[PDB]
Amino acid sequence: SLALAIAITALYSAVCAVGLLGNVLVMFGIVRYTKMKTATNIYIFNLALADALATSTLPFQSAKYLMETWPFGELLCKAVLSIDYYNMFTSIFTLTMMSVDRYIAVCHPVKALDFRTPAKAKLINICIWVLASGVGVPIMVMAVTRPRDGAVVCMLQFPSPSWYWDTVTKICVFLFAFVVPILIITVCYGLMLLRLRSVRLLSGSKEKDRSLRRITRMVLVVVGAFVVCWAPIHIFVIVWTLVDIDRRDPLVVAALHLCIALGYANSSLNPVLYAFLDENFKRCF
Amino acid sequence: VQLVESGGGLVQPGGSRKLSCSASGFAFSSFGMHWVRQAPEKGLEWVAYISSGSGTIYYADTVKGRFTISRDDPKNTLFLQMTSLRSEDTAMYYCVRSIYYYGSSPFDFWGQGTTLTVSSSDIVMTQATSSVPVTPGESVSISCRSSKSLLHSNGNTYLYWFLQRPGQSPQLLIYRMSNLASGVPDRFSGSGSGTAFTLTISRLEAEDVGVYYCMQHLEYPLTFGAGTKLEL
Amino acid sequence: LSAEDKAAVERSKMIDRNLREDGEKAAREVKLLLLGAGESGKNTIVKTGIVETHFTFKDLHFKMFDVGAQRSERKKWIHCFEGVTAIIFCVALSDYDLVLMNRMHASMKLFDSICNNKWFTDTSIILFLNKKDLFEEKIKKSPLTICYPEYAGSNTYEEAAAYIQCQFEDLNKRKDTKEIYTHFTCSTDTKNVQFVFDAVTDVIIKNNLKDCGLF
Amino acid sequence: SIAQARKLVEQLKMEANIDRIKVSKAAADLMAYCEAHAKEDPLLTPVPASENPFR
Amino acid sequence: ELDQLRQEAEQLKNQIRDARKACADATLSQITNNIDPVGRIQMRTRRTLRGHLAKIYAMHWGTDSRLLVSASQDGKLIIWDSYTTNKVHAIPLRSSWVMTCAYAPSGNYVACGGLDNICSIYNLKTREGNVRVSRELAGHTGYLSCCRFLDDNQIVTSSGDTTCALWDIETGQQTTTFTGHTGDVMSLSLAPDTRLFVSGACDASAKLWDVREGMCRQTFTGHESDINAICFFPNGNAFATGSDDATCRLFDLRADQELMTYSHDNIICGITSVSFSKSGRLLLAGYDDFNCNVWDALKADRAGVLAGHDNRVSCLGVTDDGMAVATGSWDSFLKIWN
Ligand SMILES: N=C(N)NCCCCCN1CC[C@]23c4c5ccc(O)c4O[C@H]2c2nc4ccccc4cc2C[C@@]3(O)[C@H]1C5
């Protein structure tokens, strides 16, 4: 399994480097000529912050998989777990609020004239950052490592019934981190696409294929990236908490780490998606 | 332009009172407000300050913690809440307009004032001269000495001259050192450098009699000087 | 800083806040430029210097700017309307035969100059075709031959009106980022404000797409 | 029209009978003014930071 | 007799041209080629004045070389304390379509005007703390493009009705009206002695006027496009113009003809504003290429470039002591250069 471990480590390193480079480029562009005078610019900066702070974490789990041990103590165990949960919730909520903001911009323009302001965008971003801390604080508290099962591992501690409690928090995380955000994103973008079909953007050639097709391609790219970079981890933890499959199988471990690689590729490719899909970034030569 | 104060009257020691001031005739919200008191046989003393927008509030050390200053801009009223009244706060309280920008004339307007009677470090300004005998048509000089140089790095010497006529509220003559005020005849001249300052009246008049006070606005608290009384 | 320089800075901050509030209130408003020939009639859609009329239609604040009293070089003051939401252009269909040079050709030249202006490249135009009743009653006697020697069509209100509108939008160049909205002015109805409302709503949607950066 | 041409030719006649100097004299005067005030020109020569109020 | 009058006018023009040609012996460049040039002038931005939310069209310094006033499309007349970047006053305007602004030499009044065809006068010094409008001057039939104070009671205005006017602020009346331009007058420049003033219009001509008598003394015709900017030399015996032909020309009052031409092959945008240095050696001009070019007046050589604005430079002006240059532009920013 040496070749498999080398491939997994190389994938982790490439994903982390790509994410860090993309986040650095995004912040440099925002500082230079993409100043936060617009709500979507504020949301782009916030997503870049969440993606970078999440990307600073991946080498820790890479070394954890490479060493099969936890030299990080209960201290950095609780730290890495809280950071992972915090970054997950903040990035998901920022994407959801981007979808809602675009839907309000297109479908309700008269009220969007007052609602879409930099002050309200900053307030909403602050509320999003604060709200996920209320879910990360129990991850700060109830996360202490153990020298069990032949090594040092991390596991959330719950009172009786511990199985009921861990199933409850897994179900709540899946419901309020994946399903509700994806439903809101798809509903908002579909209503936005219907309004964009109605408005004077599809009336002749070199207009529909130049604007509406590009908009549709962008929204399917965003939703598909979300699906393909957040579905395998959630279905894998669901099947883990549902059925009892070998926890030491090398193929199972490789599949789980590939799922984690896809989840980190989400934050690696979101800044690249903004760089290659923002028409404002395309205009900003 | 008129500031009319209300309140005052007899009050037992340790009591409470609230002084009011109705402003009418100017843009009240754009002016910072000062409270200045004067003992029945002594000079002026600064009490409290509130800025435009009620951002910064400054109090005198002898009044801090017991006095509260506030303003109500929509109703054009200024307040001074008094708590735990002592026998050392019996005086006549004045309200002073004050605006602040480049080229301003702070302390330009004063109110008539109301008297409060209670039943039975900062730099200093020295005016050693008192009861100076004067005659009409003469030239006199009134000197004020401070304890620190009032010349700031901005190049402004922060010395204010006031004239309190008998039975009248004090009036600003010169706001910054050598800067005549509006409505003041061009016979009052301001001069000085650093610590020593002088006010020169080239030609006198019967309306120029009174008590001349010297104030500093370089740093809080604002400190006056025992005025040099002019008399015939 | 001295005791008065600090107060000066406080005053400066206070009027900074006032400027920001005023700018937000101004940015929550749409601006319209009223153009057209004098004989077309700019007072039909409403009822020294330039005249500003303000009206509110379903929670949207409007700012009309009639510049018909400025008898000067337009090239020296047309750039101050660079950021207008839309242009309302009034052309009377009744003046296809009256001559002060036909009035209709004067309107065509003015429309051509405004539409292809270097300041209004992506600025939408709300074309208003006025005097529908007089034009309908007049086309039964004088045809479109005087206005158009190359018409070669019939003599009815619908066909002639459609032909005039088609030619006026054919004057438009670079029909990719610009939209010309054409409406026939209604006498006993309040649909003109509704039409302007839809045009400005489309412009707001376009501006929001451009701001959100997915256009 | 009619009186406009008369006004134009009258203005041209008034402008024609004017005292004039050579271009060399005017250029010399401009050069002399520029040379006589070059010292008191902060935009031309470098200014010390102490004297400059915009730091 | 229209043909005869036209022939007489043509003969008079030919006589004036012959006199102008006879008065020229050696060009300005010929007798300034032996003067020492200044190599390069690197002026950095010392202050950036923020607060405007629309396009800046005009600004004017005060006499004290510390206060300045700026006008924008946001409807605000802002007085700045340039030494600390402090804002002294923020005057709302009844009409937001302002195109010019001025500072009274006494520092008590600020004027503005534009598409409303009204020159408004505002009182900075007032017993109350607010700036109040003194009176509105009406009578122009076009937009006001420039206005300059003679004193507290006299102001001169230029309008788009091909007419300059002199007003009396005591009574709000036209003391003297100036006629003769066939195009819209765009710029004004009071002489240092405030006895004459020049105006450049859309007829590609600049006219020297007499304030007291009210007639036109000289007419200068070298430009091929409409003149947007005009400014007097510090000595009052010359003036410089700027038009949309990407060209600045220096005219002489006594020699009655053009002296020097300031143009470059790579410059094609028009000139929006122009000003002189304290000694008259430098000619600063604002262009439509987001730049301000510093010209050596006696050498017609580009001595520097002020490149700090992202939109069109619409106005500039040098302080009375030559300490700084304030450049306003269409990006809603004012920049102080030294
Ligand atoms: N887009 C950005 N910003 N991505 C950067 C952050 C990416 C990683 C986020 N992190 C969050 C916490 C975590 C997790 C994920 C999905 C669903 C969960 O229920 C869940 O619980 C954790 C978890 N529990 C496990 C329990 C048993 C066996 C395996 C488990 C594997 C994991 C993985 C995981 O650590 C993981 C995903």
- DSSP-derived 3-state class of residue A188: helix
Q: E66-95: buried (b, 16+ CB within 10 Å) or exposed (e) per residue?
A: bbbbbbbbbbbbbbbbbbbbbbbbbbebeb
What phi and psi, each to the nearest 5 degrees, are found at residue C58?
50, 65
Do B134 and B105 lie in one domain? The reply is no
- Ligand 1 binding pocket mutation candidate from A65, A82, A149, A237 (most atoms within 8 A of CB): A237
Chain E residues contacting B via beta carbons under 8 Å: 66-67, 81, 86, 88-89, 107, 127-130
Cα–Cα dist C28/A114, whole Å:
7
Distance from CA of E191 to the nearest CA of C (A): 26
Q: E12-38: buried (b, 16+ CB within 10 Å) or exposed (e) per residue?
A: beeebeeeeeebeeeebeebbeeeeeb
Q: Is C130 inside a domain boundary?
A: yes
Asked whether C99 and C39 are in contact (CB, 8 A), the reply is no
Which of B6, D17, D28, B208 minimizes the C-alpha distance to E34?
D28
Q: Provide the phi-psi class of E321: left if phi over 0, else alpha when psi is between -120 and 50, else beta.
A: alpha
A88 CA from centroid of ligand 1 (Å): 8
> Does the beta carbon of A12 lie inside 6 Å of ligand 1?
no
- DSSP-derived 3-state class of residue C178: coil
Q: Which amino acid is at E253?
A: L
Report chain E residues whose CB lies below 8 A from the CB of B27.
128-130
Instruction: Give the count of domains, chain E.
Output: 1
Cα–Cα dist E45/E48, whole Å:
7
Do B78 and B166 lie in one domain? The reply is no
- DSSP-derived 3-state class of residue C90: strand
| Encoded tokens for B154 | 């901005």
Parallel/antiparallel/unpaired status of strands B9-11 and B114-118: parallel
Cα–Cα dist A20/B46, whole Å:
60
Residue A208 burial by Cβ neighbours in a 10 Å radius (0-12, 13-18, 19+) = middle
Q: Is C18 inside a domain boundary?
A: no
Nearest to E218 among D2, D15, D33 (CB): D15
Report chain A residues whose CB lies below 8 A from the CB of C60.
110
Q: At what angle do helices A250-277 and A2-33 cross, to 10 degrees?
A: 20
Which neighbouring-strand residues pair with E173? E168
Distance from CA of A54 to the nearest CA of C (A): 25
- Ligand 1 binding pocket mutation candidate from A47, A84, A267 (most atoms within 8 A of CB): A84
| Encoded tokens for A278 | 């923002």
CATH 1.20.1070.10 holds for A2-283: yes
| Encoded tokens for E71 | 């006008």
Which neighbouring-strand residues pair with B18? B81
| Encoded tokens for E298 | 């006696």
| Encoded tokens for D36 | 């006589």
Nearest to E129 among B26, B102, B103 (CB): B26
Cα–Cα dist E159/E78, whole Å:
23
Q: E175-197: buried (b, 16+ CB within 10 Å) or exposed (e) per residue?
A: bbebebbebbbbbbbbbeebebb
> Does the beta carbon of A170 lie inside 6 Å of ligand 1?
yes
Q: What would you report as the CA-atom Rg of chain C, rounded to the nearest whole angstrom?
A: 21
Asked whether A28 and A277 are in contact (CB, 8 A), the reply is no
Rounded to 10 degrees, the C-alpha dihedral C112/C116/C120/C123 comes to: 70
Asked whether A174 and A240 are in contact (CB, 8 A), the reply is no
Asked whether C192 and C185 are in contact (CB, 8 A), the reply is yes
Which neighbouring-strand residues pair with E45? E337
Asked whether B199 and B141 are in contact (CB, 8 A), the reply is yes
State how far the alpha carbon of C44 is from the alpha carbons of B69, C67, C98, E196, in Å.
59, 15, 20, 48
| Atom 26 of ligand 1, nearest CA residue | A237
3-state secondary structure chain B: CEEEEECCEEECCCCEEEEEEEEECCCHHHCEEEEEEECCCCCEEEEEEECHHHCCEEECCCCCCCEEEEEECCCCEEEEEEECCCCCCCEEEEEEEECCCCCCCCCCCECCCEEEEECCCCCCEECCCCCEECCCCCCEEEEEEECCCCECCCCCECEEEEEECCCCCCEEEECCCCCECCCCCCCEEEEEECCEEEEEECCCCHHHCEEEEEEECCCCCCCCCCCEEEEC
Q: State the CATH number of the domain containing residue E72.
A: 2.130.10.10
Cα–Cα dist E52/E71, whole Å:
9
Inter-chain CB proximity C205 and A117 less than 8 Å: no
Distance from CA of C203 to the nearest CA of A (A): 10
CA E302 to chain centre: 21
| Encoded tokens for B142 | 């009134």
Which residue carries 């007639």 as its tokens? Answer: E215
What phi and psi, each to the nearest 5 degrees, are found at residue B133?
-80, 130
Inter-chain CB proximity D11 and E325 less than 8 Å: no
Which long-range CB contacts under 8 A does A163-167 form with residues at least 24 apart? A166/A241, A167/A241
Parent domain of E40: 1-337
What are the structural domains, with CATH classification, of chain D? 2-54 (4.10.260.10)
Instruction: Give the count of domains, chain C.
Output: 1
Q: State the CATH number of the domain containing residue C201.
A: 3.40.50.300
Asked whether E272 and E288 are in contact (CB, 8 A), the reply is yes
- DSSP-derived 3-state class of residue A268: helix
| Encoded tokens for E123 | 């009182």
Q: Which chains touch C (3 or more CB pairs under 8 A)?
A: A, B, E
DSSP label at C124? E
Cα–Cα dist B56/B41, whole Å:
32
Parent domain of C121: 29-206
- DSSP-derived 3-state class of residue C130: strand
Cα–Cα dist A227/E219, whole Å:
76
Inter-chain CB proximity A101 and C212 less than 8 Å: yes
Do B201 and B174 lie in one domain? The reply is yes
| Encoded tokens for E163 | 């007419």
Asked whether E24 and D22 are in contact (CB, 8 A), the reply is yes
C179 interface with A at CB cutoff 8 Å? yes
Q: What would you report as the CA-atom Rg of chain E, rounded to the nearest whole angstrom?
A: 20
Do B21 and B110 lie in one domain? The reply is yes
Cα–Cα dist C195/C202, whole Å:
11
CA geometry: angle E207, E212, E217, nearest 5 deg: 30
Which of C184, A244, C8 minimizes the C-alpha distance to E79?
C8
Which of C173, C137, C181 minimizes the C-alpha distance to C155?
C137
Pick the residue from chain E with its C-alpha nearest to B183.
Answer: E127
Do B132 and B114 lie in one domain? The reply is no
Helix and strand counts by DSSP (H, E) for chain D: 2, 0
A17 CA from centroid of ligand 1 (Å): 20
Which of E259, E197, E202 minimizes the C-alpha distance to E27?
E259
Inter-chain CB proximity B154 and C8 less than 8 Å: no
3-state secondary structure chain E: CHHHHHHHHHHHHHHHHHHHHHCCCCCHHHHHCCCCCCCCCCCCEEEEECCCCCCEEEEEECCCCCEEEEEECCCEEEEEECCCCEEEEEEECCCCCEEEEEECCCCCEEEEEECCCEEEEEECCCCCCCCEEEEEEECCCCCEEEEEECCCCEEEEEECCCEEEEEECCCCEEEEEEECCCCCEEEEEECCCCCEEEEEECCCCEEEEECCCCCEEEEECCCCCCEEEEEECCCCCEEEEEECCCEEEEEECCCCEEEEEEECCCCCCCEEEEEECCCCCEEEEEECCCCEEEEECCCCEEEEEECCCCCCEEEEEECCCCCCEEEEECCCCEEEEC
Residue C150 burial by Cβ neighbours in a 10 Å radius (0-12, 13-18, 19+) = exposed
Find which of E52, E53, E120, E330 to mutate to test the C interface (most C CBs within 10 Å of its CB).
Answer: E53
Q: Return the half-sphere exposure (C-beta side, CA atoms, 13 A cut-off) of residue E138.
A: 5
What phi and psi, each to the nearest 5 degrees, are found at residue B47?
-115, -65
Instruction: Give the count of domains, chain B.
Output: 2
Do B87 and B131 lie in one domain? The reply is no
Inter-chain CB proximity C3 and B158 less than 8 Å: yes
| Encoded tokens for E125 | 């010094």
Do B90 and B105 lie in one domain? The reply is yes
Parent domain of B31: 2-118
Which neighbouring-strand residues pair with E137? E119
Nearest to E278 among D20, D22, D43 (CB): D43
Which residue carries 């006008």 as its tokens? Answer: E71
Q: State the CATH number of the domain containing residue B42.
A: 2.60.40.10
D12 interface with E at CB cutoff 8 Å? yes
Parallel/antiparallel/unpaired status of strands B91-98 and B114-118: antiparallel
Question: E213: Cβ–Cβ under 8 A, 6 or more apart, which residues?
Answer: none
Handedness of CA A170, A175, A176, A181 (dihedral sign): positive
Cα–Cα dist B109/B122, whole Å:
25
Cα–Cα dist A205/C10, whole Å:
57
Cα–Cα dist E203/C75, whole Å:
14
Cα–Cα dist E51/E85, whole Å:
11
Cα–Cα dist A230/A263, whole Å:
6
Cα–Cα dist E278/E324, whole Å:
10
DSSP label at C160? H
- Ligand 1 binding pocket mutation candidate from A85, A88, A140 (most atoms within 8 A of CB): A88
Asked whether C61 and C29 are in contact (CB, 8 A), the reply is yes
Report chain C residues whose CB lies below 8 A from the CB of E183.
73
A199 interface with C at CB cutoff 8 Å? yes
Establish whether chain E is in contact with chain B, requiring a minimum of 3 CB pairs below 8 angstroms. Answer: yes
Question: A279: Cβ–Cβ under 8 A, 6 or more apart, which residues?
Answer: C210, C213, C214, C215
Q: B76-100: buried (b, 16+ CB within 10 Å) or exposed (e) per residue?
A: bebbbebeebeeebbbbbbbbbbbb
CB atoms within 10 A of CB C146: 14
CA geometry: angle A195, A127, C213, nearest 5 deg: 35
Which residue carries 């900074």 as its tokens? Answer: C16
Which of C206, C171, C181 minimizes the C-alpha distance to C127?
C181
Cα–Cα dist E69/E89, whole Å:
9
Cα–Cα dist E206/E188, whole Å:
10
Find which of E41, E82, E252, E257 to mutate to test the D interface (most D CBs within 10 Å of its CB).
Answer: E252
CA geometry: angle B201, B202, B204, nearest 5 deg: 70
Parallel/antiparallel/unpaired status of strands C61-66 and C29-36: parallel
Question: A56: Cβ–Cβ under 8 A, 6 or more apart, which residues?
Answer: none
Which of D43, D40, D34, D11 minimizes the C-alpha distance to E237?
D34
Cα–Cα dist E225/E202, whole Å:
7
Chain B residues contacting E via beta carbons under 8 Å: 1, 25-27, 30-31, 99, 101-103, 182
Find which of B51, B100, B123 to mutate to test the C interface (most C CBs within 10 Å of its CB).
Answer: B100
Parallel/antiparallel/unpaired status of strands B44-50 and B32-38: antiparallel
Inter-chain CB proximity C3 and B220 less than 8 Å: yes
Q: Which amino acid is at C177?
A: T
Report chain E residues whose CB lies below 8 A from the CB of D29.
235, 237
Query: Of all helices (H) and strands (E), which one includes residue D12?
Result: helix D3-16
Distance from CA of B67 to the nearest CA of E (A): 28
Alpha helices in chain C (DSSP H): 3-27, 103-115, 132-138, 157-170, 191-212
Inter-chain CB proximity E129 and B30 less than 8 Å: yes
Inter-chain CB proximity E142 and C72 less than 8 Å: yes
